[PDB]
Design a protein around this motif. Structure first.
Motif, PDB file in Angstrom:
ATOM      1  N   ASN A  60      40.102  40.791  42.784  1.00  0.00           N
ATOM      2  CA  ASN A  60      40.057  41.273  44.032  1.00  0.00           C
ATOM      3  C   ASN A  60      41.253  40.797  44.949  1.00  0.00           C
ATOM      4  N   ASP A  66      40.371  34.988  42.238  1.00  0.00           N
ATOM      5  CA  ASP A  66      40.593  35.385  43.699  1.00  0.00           C
ATOM      6  C   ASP A  66      41.797  34.850  44.150  1.00  0.00           C
ATOM      7  N   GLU A 101      43.443  40.502  48.353  1.00  0.00           N
ATOM      8  CA  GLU A 101      43.145  40.648  49.652  1.00  0.00           C
ATOM      9  C   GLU A 101      44.331  40.201  50.744  1.00  0.00           C
ATOM     10  N   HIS A 121      44.585  34.790  47.770  1.00  0.00           N
ATOM     11  CA  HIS A 121      44.749  35.325  49.060  1.00  0.00           C
ATOM     12  C   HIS A 121      46.067  34.894  49.485  1.00  0.00           C
ATOM     13  N   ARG A 158      35.972  35.563  37.583  1.00  0.00           N
ATOM     14  CA  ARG A 158      36.316  36.346  38.711  1.00  0.00           C
ATOM     15  C   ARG A 158      37.350  35.619  39.462  1.00  0.00           C
TER      16      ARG A 158
END
Lengths: 139, 289, 353, 241, 390, 35, 251, 286
Positions: free
Chosen positions: C79, C135, C81, C137, C133
């Protein structure tokens, strides 16, 4: 909020001989109303009416952004920054109190060097440091 | 009443039913048109590297220095002194917005409008309040283009006696390339109704105004003998407009006369349309030829 | 709010420069902005700085049941972002046509290259398997978000260390870093993205452009190619119309550049492992520059916890006790009772009839 | 499973450099301002466009220099073996429609419709093989049906690489086999590429050959669609007069 | 040029889900026939392996004569063989990968007279199914029509001999085209090739072993191993005193037969071993003295259920290259060879087999399944390299 | 062969470069020469 | 799952599907009776107009907000139907449901034929209805209450809206029943709800689906629905009288 | 939208049994239903009532029976509204209309005797057949309800439901075994599948098959669901105006008669299309 000019605010502008101002151009001008009750409004010639270098400026230079501290430091009556920086590279500057500077050297390389080395002059106090930095950048 | 249910039939291509060979010059986008020393580009083409490249499908039409391509499907483009028909879609403070099948909207300025009264009484800001009262949303006007703006917009005016809000009738919308340019786009066909052939594709059919601007309402029942004529012209207009035929007064009159023998309700079939279009084609062939 | 507009002097200035083949910050055409990596304390956490861009990567795993079909592998979410602080414009639900192409670039690269070994991440089949998972940023936007995001994801995945389990017979057991030592992962290759920008209709190109150079450009070409000599994705986009010799030149450039970048990444990970194994101090804290004005260090301090008893005691003692008007509850009919000033009548009845 | 026999024949019986059969049509719908219908092999597509109009919403979202192309994508719920119904929020439709908007913001000569929108809709009724190239070709035909000017006739085709050879116009069976797929969007007159895609691994020495085979298969699609357009324009010219 | 057609299919997935997948088919005008009497060279140009005409005849199995009797058709005295791709497809989709690999080696060889024909890619040999059918009948119809077409393209010059093991093709098809027979295989041999009596004896061997074949394959039904059962049965069967239970080991010279049950009970057979491994605790009944065997008659047993279930974690290897390039290149299922002779082979699914053929790996076991003769597994972790001490 | 022409072509810049110098200027302007 | 709520178990099967008590027998009655109804107007204090309707096992609360900013020359009528999760045999998903939207539209196409929106240009009205308990005919309560709320909030309407409900017995001789309950509604074959203006004598809304296929039963179902809407009127007649007497006397 | 004068002309014409097309107060424009258009599905239809365009598809799949009754299947409807039909249907915006049509169709089909439910169960409590009806709006030209209730009966008449003979015995192969025949199916007995009839009211007269212009001049309408036998399933009033009690009784007779004629003529046309089989080719979208 954005400011607001008028077509007749320029020098010798009337309903017929309007000035040519496009979208996305930089203007040198002063304010006349800046209270927190309305959008600020600026006129762009003079108090008397003779534009003293005001109007639309900038044709072959670079506009970059610096903090308010460096602008305050440069705009001093006991400031030797501009004289020494112009000793190496001849230059002409138009400061702006909103955090903007317009520079124009001779060579594109010199314009790059002045653009990078002027943003760092707020720090690096003179004497023990400034002469050696100037000598190093002489090249 | 039987609710007939036929079956779809495969279309026959190449138009072999009559048989013709075209003598024109046809192009598709990317084709290189004549590239001689000096030529001027028209609408439908563009220029690359020392090349005149067509940019739309159609046929080239040149008048003595000009290479251009005429497409067969476009939207209406405004020209000075052109009869148009439109509908109000927005009522603004000092203008209306009218949709006339163009790339943008058309503006009807308050300065150009035949206000009720039809004479010199006054024009002030008191009228601005009631301008949005009479020209409400979704009304029909019939005006004339005034000028062309700088972004393809069109300004249209209503400074005459024949222009203004229209009354009862039916509207048929077709493509804005099937109306033939003329000098009289207003017609009074000797059948019992009239028609306005808008150059923008709006066809308006209304009964004849008995004897003799929207001042009169005339919201009274229309006689039975007038509806049958309006329905006949509506169906005939659909029939002529569909296959190819370019529209004007004689073609509609010819098909109307050709449509008397059998009823108005039964003409929706693929073949009855064909037996009427061919008959109009041959009557035009034996009259013009 | 929106972003400051672009003048007509900056466009001219960048284009006279680019024609003359000299850029603002001095670096020549085929150069990168130098890189600077920093590792957390718990595994799978790093901070990469390409020029003046920042990305934070952090990997974390967890144990679930493996769907239906593909009973002998594990799943791998991602994901991306974009943080409001990366740049003024980024807004939680108003930049939905960059997020998609970015998540896609990242997922196609990382998951279709088959460099992570999701074969050997099972415990049973049909039963609990590890679901990793990743991640990332974005912290500071200065152009070339995807090169930095890719390097960040690579390092974060090559620094993780799972938990570990004992499986024998038909019985499970879950350890902890004191019961059993965390275990590394298996990484076949290292797919690393590269981007190119084209200027004034493909006549010039510039390697690794920043955000101003990004507003005076036609379109972008990205070429993701793992180590050795194996290309893994390309995605032309923007406004460009490309030739065929140029794709090959670009492929050469990406080969060279990924070689150098992999050198750097390997060296940095080795040095970090050496530091962690010597026994010295590591972490986000011991990374703050000390030769700099905005850093300060203070060892621990008992402040003086000698007085709190006395103050609390006097405060409790020095204030008014609870009062003693006690209220009464009224009973209407089992189910409803009222306390307060009350109502006059027993209940309303035939008030208006 | 064999995807290429020793004789050289594929699963369905065509050679390496052989396309499927296409069967097009122009002018399908009446209410809309344009239409098209193409069946590339066993994939059935559909496209509907709406001409330059007033910007919907009028939320001051216009561009004073060119027009605003807006393309969507949808898919029927019976387009494959399993139902696989999806809501209108999936990111596959948005990303394919974003690549569609990218290629049609470059092919269309858009600096002729200031303050105007162009709405393009694509509907896939049966997907088996390359969906992207079928949608691009169906929307190129629908835009031609609408009379919108463009620089050239953009056409797209895919390719692959199995056992040291380059394929062309891959199918779903071949696509779902883990191979280096690759797709273009070509302008035949100039040879320029509007969009390039690839996935899975492939060595750098065979990229030139896969790209060349894809470009050649796109130039082969160009002639077949060109004959359809020429037959349609000659049909309407015959109809007119 | 080409002519599109369709092919529906009914694929059954492992989860019990069938689907009517539809797929494509492209016919052509000119399928090369790889013959030296093709009456037009250029149209195909015969760019491959090409026969030389010396034979008396030509024999084409329809589908079965190459399905099982393939081991015959290798003798370099046999000459003039041509394979129809539909038989190859039948054997591939019906006989796994081994027989098919021998068949494709046979084809790809310049020692024999083997070629392959595109029956199904030729424009008038393809035939669609009809109301009421079967793979066998459709198959024989297609082979017949292919034969007729090949004959007529040959201009009725080289006498085709359609061999079948079908009898009904003999009674009907073989009587309506002069120059082509539908005869059984032994009749083929006798009628043509007497001095090949070695093949005659091998054919009688395999035909008596064929009569066996149906009997062993229809005396097997649909079960491979005795199905297990609950535990309360095993508490009771212990307590009542009809179940012993001890450890179980295996020999290693003979490791599919000599299985021992440490109280020693001789377990003979896999079907008797019933999906169970060394080091295990199994409960066992006795057996009648009329069915005991020799090393004297010993007390062999029968195991119905495993109380307590002891596994371990072995070290295996991957197959070899020339037998991986034939697995496909996305070969989900794979077979692994353990390191001690005491352990069966294990069925696991991986996708790295073509780049780990010089390493020892490790696997484990999740479930023994009876629709397989082997137990299923899954990879665990990599090990060192075969050749270095480490 | 092919590896060394383009090696010498697409290297990181060797040694004394402008970017080097301007980063020196940046981190010496933000330095702290009083501790 | 949901990032704006408290997450619990992923799945939860209610104990009704495990309820070992077999379904009981409803019983019999007289189909010419109506459940006694009590109506109150002006309940909420912070709402411009509100009403609470309760009859037997049905509990519905309706409130009306005043006109707000934003067929103009006319005002919109926004509607929102929502029922309490603790109503009925099982729980319901808070986010929404297709049944709620269908009943909201069946309300919207029934309260607009009463009010005159040609008096509120560029304005809009919002109506919210909540069902605390489902113990019988529901759509016959979401219409009466949302019309009472409108009448006590001082908006101009031509007339009121009075609703009713019916259901079809499942026996070999089916007969329509008036004011069915859940014991007489889950065992039924068809249902009908009518919306009648009692003075103007005009049907406002109609809805019905089921197994009754002869066009002679629906005539009685419709006309007994009309008799129900003409028999529920007097209670709503005295309810607004008492509501206005109290509101005026409160000044 | 249309002006007030056009609405006055239209309502006067309707009161005079004349309409702009020329038909009467009860005439019905023809339709072009067809079948077997889509390959991958198990049944298809294509209804063209005018400027509108419908396309549906039915796929039968394996499933599990619901809890209340084990010897039954169920039906799932999903009326999509493609955005190519109209530009305002772009992305979100066609959801409310699709839900309205799907719930109406569910109410139409929510009965025990709609077609059958015994035929779709094979093993009680363990398996059942499920039917996926997938409507796809292609164009909108008015009277969408009848143009969909016809394409649903049409597609339902063309189902296949391939027969499965698998034994459920545990000793035998419980896993579903098909018949292995690619062309072995079974019909569905759709003779009494109901259809919707719309009756718009203009002035004090009711009109069948109103156009969009004639719909904009109407204030209310009623929907009736009638089978071939002539029985009513659902009855929903839709519109923006009152109706009056009498007009219900005088609209029911016209709904009955139009329904009976519609059903008889659809049976006749489907038998005519079915009498000749693999001949006549199939043409659609090309």
């Amino acid at each position: 909020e954005p400011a607001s000019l008028s077509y007749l605010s320029f020098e010798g502008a009337t309903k017929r001989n309007r000035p040519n101002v496009q979208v996305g151009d930089l203007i040198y001008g002063q304010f006349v109303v800046a209270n927190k009750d309305m959008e600020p409004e600026m006129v762009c010639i003079d108090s008397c009416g003779r534009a003293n270098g005001m109007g639309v400026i900038g044709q072959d230079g670079l506009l970059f952004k610096v903090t308010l501290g460096l602008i305050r430091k440069l705009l001093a009556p006991d400031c030797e920054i501009i004289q020494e920086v112009g000793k190496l590279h001849p230059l002409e500057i138009v400061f702006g109190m909103n955090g903007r500077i317009w520079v124009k050297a001779k060579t594109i390389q010199q314009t790059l060097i002045l653009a990078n080395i002027l943003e760092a002059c707020e720090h690096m106090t003179s004497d023990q440091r400034k002469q050696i930095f100037s000598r190093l950048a002489e090249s | 009443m039987a609710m007939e249910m036929r079956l779809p039939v495969a279309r026959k291509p190449l138009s072999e039913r009559l048989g013709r060979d075209t003598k024109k010059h046809l192009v598709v986008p990317g084709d290189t048109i004549t590239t001689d020393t000096g030529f001027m580009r028209g609408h439908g083409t563009y220029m690359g590297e020392e090349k005149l490249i067509a940019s739309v499908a159609g046929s080239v039409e040149r008048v003595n220095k000009l290479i251009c391509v005429k497409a067969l499907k476009t939207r209406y483009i405004g020209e000075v002194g052109d009869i148009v028909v439109g509908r109000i879609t927005e009522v603004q403070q000092k203008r209306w917005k009218v949709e006339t099948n163009s790339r943008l909207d058309s503006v009807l300025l308050l300065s150009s409008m035949n206000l009720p009264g039809g004479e010199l009484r006054r024009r002030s800001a008191e009228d601005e309040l009631a301008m949005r009262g009479f020209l409400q949303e979704g009304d029909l006007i019939s005006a004339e283009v005034q000028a062309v703006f700088s972004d393809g917009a069109v300004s249209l005016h209503t400074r005459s006696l024949k222009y203004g809000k229209l009354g009862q009738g039916v509207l048929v919308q077709v493509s804005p390339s099937l109306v033939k340019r003329q000098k009289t786009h207003f017609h009074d066909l000797p059948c019992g109704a009239s028609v306005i052939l808008g150059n923008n594709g709006f066809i308006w059919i209304y009964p004849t105004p008995e004897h003799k601007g929207g001042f009169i309402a005339n919201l009274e029942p229309v006689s039975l003998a007038d509806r049958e004529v309006i329905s006949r012209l509506r169906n005939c207009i659909i029939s002529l407009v569909t296959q190819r035929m370019m529209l004007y007064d004689t073609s509609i009159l010819y098909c109307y006369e050709a449509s008397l023998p059998h009823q108005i309700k039964d003409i929706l079939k693929p073949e009855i349309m064909e037996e009427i279009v061919m008959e109009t084609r041959q009557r035009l062939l034996e009259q013009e030829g | 709010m929106k972003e400051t507009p672009l003048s007509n002097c900056e466009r001219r200035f960048l284009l006279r420069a680019i024609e003359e083949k000299k850029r603002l910050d001095g670096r020549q055409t085929y150069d990168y902005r130098n890189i600077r990596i920093s590792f957390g304390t718990d595994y799978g956490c790093c901070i990469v700085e390409l020029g003046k861009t920042r990305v934070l990567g952090q990997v974390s795993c967890e144990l679930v049941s493996p769907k239906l079909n593909r009973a002998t592998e594990g799943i791998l979410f991602f994901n991306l972002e974009l943080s409001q602080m990366a740049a003024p414009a980024f807004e939680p639900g108003r930049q939905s046509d960059l997020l998609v192409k970015l998540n896609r670039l990242m997922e196609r690269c990382l998951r279709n290259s088959k460099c992570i070994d999701t074969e050997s991440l099972c415990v049973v089949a049909g039963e609990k398997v590890w679901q990793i998972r990743v991640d990332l940023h974005l912290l500071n936007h200065d152009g070339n978000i995807i090169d930095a995001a890719s390097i960040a994801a690579i390092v974060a995945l090559c620094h993780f260390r799972r938990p570990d389990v004992s499986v024998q017979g038909d019985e499970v057991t879950l350890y902890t870093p004191e019961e059993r030592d965390p275990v590394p992962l298996s990484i076949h290759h290292m797919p690393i993205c590269v981007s190119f920008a084209f200027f004034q209709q493909g006549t010039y190109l510039l390697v690794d452009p920043n955000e101003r150079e990004e507003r005076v450009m036609d379109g972008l070409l990205v070429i993701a190619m793992n180590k050795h000599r194996e290309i893994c994705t390309i995605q032309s986009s923007g406004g460009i119309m490309l030739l065929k010799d140029q794709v090959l030149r670009c492929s050469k450039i990406a080969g060279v550049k990924v070689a150098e970048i992999t050198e750097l990444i390997l060296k940095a990970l080795e040095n970090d492992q050496k530091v962690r194994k010597e026994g010295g101090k590591f972490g986000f804290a011991e990374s703050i520059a000390n030769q700099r004005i905005t850093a300060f260090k203070m060892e621990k301090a008992p402040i003086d916890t000698s007085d709190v008893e006395e103050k609390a005691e006097e405060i409790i003692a020095e204030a008014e006790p609870p009062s003693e008007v006690v209220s009464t509850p009224v009973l209407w009919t089992p189910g409803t009772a009222q306390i307060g000033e009350g109502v006059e009548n027993s209940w309303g009845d035939l008030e208006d009839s | 499973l064999e995807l290429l026999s020793d004789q050289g024949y594929r699963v369905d019986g065509r050679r390496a450099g052989e396309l499927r059969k296409i069967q097009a049509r122009m002018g399908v719908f009446a209410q809309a301002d344009g239409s098209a219908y193409i069946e590339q092999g066993n994939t059935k597509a559909l496209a509907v466009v709406y001409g330059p109009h007033e910007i919907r919403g009028s939320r001051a979202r216009a561009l004073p220099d060119r027009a605003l192309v807006n393309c969507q994508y949808s898919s029927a719920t019976f387009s494959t073996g399993e139902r696989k119904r999806r809501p209108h929020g999936d990111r596959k439709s948005c990303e394919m429609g974003l690549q569609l908007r990218q290629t049609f913001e470059a092919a269309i000569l858009t600096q002729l419709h200031p303050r105007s929108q162009i709405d393009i809709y694509v509907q896939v009724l049966q997907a088996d093989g390359g969906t992207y190239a079928a949608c691009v070709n169906a929307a190129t035909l629908a835009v031609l049906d609408a009379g919108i000017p463009m620089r050239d006739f953009v056409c797209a085709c895919s390719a692959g690489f199995v056992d040291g050879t380059a394929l062309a116009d891959l199918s779903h069976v071949e696509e779902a086999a883990g191979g280096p797929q690759l797709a273009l969007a070509l302008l035949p007159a100039s040879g320029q590429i509007a969009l390039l895609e690839m996935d899975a691994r492939l060595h750098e020495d065979h990229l030139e050959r896969v790209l060349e085979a894809a470009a050649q298969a796109a130039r082969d699609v160009h002639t077949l669609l060109d004959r359809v357009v020429r037959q349609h324009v000659r049909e309407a010219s015959i109809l007119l007069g | 040029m080409l002519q599109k057609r369709e092919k529906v299919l009914l694929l059954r997935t492992f989860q019990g889900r069938t689907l009517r997948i539809v797929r494509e088919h492209y016919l052509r005008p000119c399928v090369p026939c790889h013959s030296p009497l093709c009456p037009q060279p250029a149209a195909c140009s015969h760019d491959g392996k090409l026969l030389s005409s010396d034979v008396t005849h030509y024999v084409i199995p329809d589908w079965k004569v190459v399905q099982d009797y393939l081991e015959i058709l290798e003798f370099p005295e046999l000459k003039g063989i041509i394979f129809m791709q539909t038989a190859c497809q039948a054997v591939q989709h019906q006989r796994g990968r081994r027989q098919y690999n021998k068949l494709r080696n046979l084809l790809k060889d310049a020692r024999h007279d083997c070629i392959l024909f595109a029956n199904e890619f030729q424009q008038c040999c393809y035939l669609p199914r009809e109301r009421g059918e079967s793979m066998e009948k459709w198959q024989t119809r297609s082979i017949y029509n292919a034969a007729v077409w090949y004959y007529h393209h040959c201009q009725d010059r080289m006498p085709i001999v359609m061999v079948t093991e079908d009898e009904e093709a003999i009674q009907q098809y073989g009587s309506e085209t002069e120059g082509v027979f539908v005869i059984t295989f032994k009749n083929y041999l006798d009628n043509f090739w007497p001095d090949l009596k070695a093949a005659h004896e091998l054919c009688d061997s395999i035909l008596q072993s064929r009569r066996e074949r149906e009997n062993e394959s229809q005396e097997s039904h649909g079960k491979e191993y005795p199905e297990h059962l609950p535990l309360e049965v095993l508490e009771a069967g212990i307590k009542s005193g009809r179940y012993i239970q001890g450890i179980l080991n295996v020999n290693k010279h003979r490791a599919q037969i000599e299985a021992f049950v440490r109280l020693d009970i001789l377990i003979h057979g896999m079907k008797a071993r019933n999906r169970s491994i060394h080091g295990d605790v199994v409960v066992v009944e006795l057996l009648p003295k009329n069915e005991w065997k020799g090393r004297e008659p010993m007390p062999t047993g029968r195991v119905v259920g495993i109380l307590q279930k002891n596994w371990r974690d072995y070290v295996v290897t991957f197959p070899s290259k020339e037998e991986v390039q034939s697995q496909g290149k996305n070969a989900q299922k794979i077979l692994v060879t353990p390191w001690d002779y005491r352990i069966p082979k294990i069925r696991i699914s991986t996708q790295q087999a073509e780049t780990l053929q010089d390493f020892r790996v490790v696997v484990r076991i999740d479930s023994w399944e009876s629709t397989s003769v082997y137990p299923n597994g899954h990879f665990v972790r990599v090990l060192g390299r075969i050749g270095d001490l480490e | 062969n092919i590896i060394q022409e383009e090696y010498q072509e697409y290297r990181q810049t060797k040694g004394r470069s402008l970017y080097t110098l301007l980063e020196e200027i940046r981190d010496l302007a933000l330095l702290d020469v009083s501790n | 799952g949901d990032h704006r709520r408290i997450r619990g178990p992923e799945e939860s099967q209610p104990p009704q599907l495990y309820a070992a008590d077999e379904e009981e027998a409803p019983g019999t009655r007289d189909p010419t009776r109506l459940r006694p109804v009590y109506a109150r107007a002006g309940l909420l204090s912070q709402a411009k107009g509100s009403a609470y309707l309760e009859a037997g096992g049905t509990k519905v609360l309706c409130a009306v907000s005043g006109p707000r900013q934003a067929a103009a020359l006319r005002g919109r009528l926004l509607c929102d139907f929502r029922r309490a999760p603790f109503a009925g045999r099982r729980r319901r998903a808070p986010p929404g449901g297709c049944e709620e939207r269908e009943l909201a539209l069946a309300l919207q196409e029934a309260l607009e034929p009463a009010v005159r929106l040609g008096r509120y240009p560029r304005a809009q009205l919002e109506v919210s209805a909540l069902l605390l308990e489902d113990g019988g005919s529901a759509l016959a309560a979401a219409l009466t209450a949302a019309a009472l709320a409108l009448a006590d909030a001082g908006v101009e309407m031509y007339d009121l809206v009075v609703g009713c409900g019916l259901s079809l017995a499942p026996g070999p001789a089916p007969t329509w029943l008036l004011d069915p309950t859940r014991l007489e509604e889950e065992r039924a074959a068809a249902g009908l709800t009518v919306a009648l203006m009692p003075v103007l004598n005009q049907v406002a809304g109609l809805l019905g689906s089921g197994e009754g296929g002869l066009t002679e039963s629906w005539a009685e179902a419709v006309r007994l629905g009309l008799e129900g809407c003409q028999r529920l009127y007097p209670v709503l007649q005295q309810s607004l009288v008492r509501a206005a007497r109290r509101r005026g006397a409160a000044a | 939208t249309l002006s007030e004068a056009e609405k006055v002309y239209i309502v006067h014409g309707v009161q005079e049994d004349l309409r702009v097309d020329g038909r009467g107060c009860e005439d019905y424009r023809c339709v072009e239903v067809e079948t077997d258009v889509v390959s991958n599905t198990s049944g298809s239809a294509r209804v063209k009532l005018g400027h509108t365009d419908i396309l549906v598809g039915v796929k039968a799949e394996m499933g599990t029976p619901k809890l209340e009754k084990p010897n039954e299947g169920y039906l799932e409807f999903f009326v999509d509204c493609s955005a190519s039909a109209t530009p305002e249907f772009e992305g979100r915006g066609g959801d409310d209309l699709g839900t309205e049509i799907a719930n109406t169709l569910y109410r139409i089909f929510n009965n025990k005797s709609s077609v059958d439910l015994k035929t779709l169960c094979i093993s009680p409590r363990e398996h059942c057949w499920v039917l996926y009806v997938d409507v796809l709006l292609l164009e909108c030209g008015g009277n969408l309800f009848d143009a969909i209730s016809i394409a649903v009966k049409a597609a339902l008449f063309n189902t296949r439901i391939p027969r499965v003979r698998v034994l459920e015995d545990e000793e035998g192969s419980k896993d579903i075994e098909l018949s292995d025949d690619p062309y072995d199916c079974i019909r569905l007995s759709v003779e009494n599948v109901p259809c919707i009839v719309t009756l718009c009211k203009i002035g004090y007269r009711h009109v069948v098959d109103a156009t969009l212009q004639e719909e904009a001049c109407s204030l209310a309408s009623l929907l009736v669901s009638v089978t071939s036998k002539g029985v009513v399933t659902c009855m929903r009033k839709v519109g923006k105006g009152s109706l009056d009690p009498e007009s219900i009784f005088e609209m029911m007779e016209t709904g009955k008669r139009v329904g009976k004629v519609l059903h008889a003529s659809l049976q006749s046309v489907v038998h005519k299309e079915e009498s000749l089989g693999p001949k006549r080719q199939k043409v659609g979208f090309l």
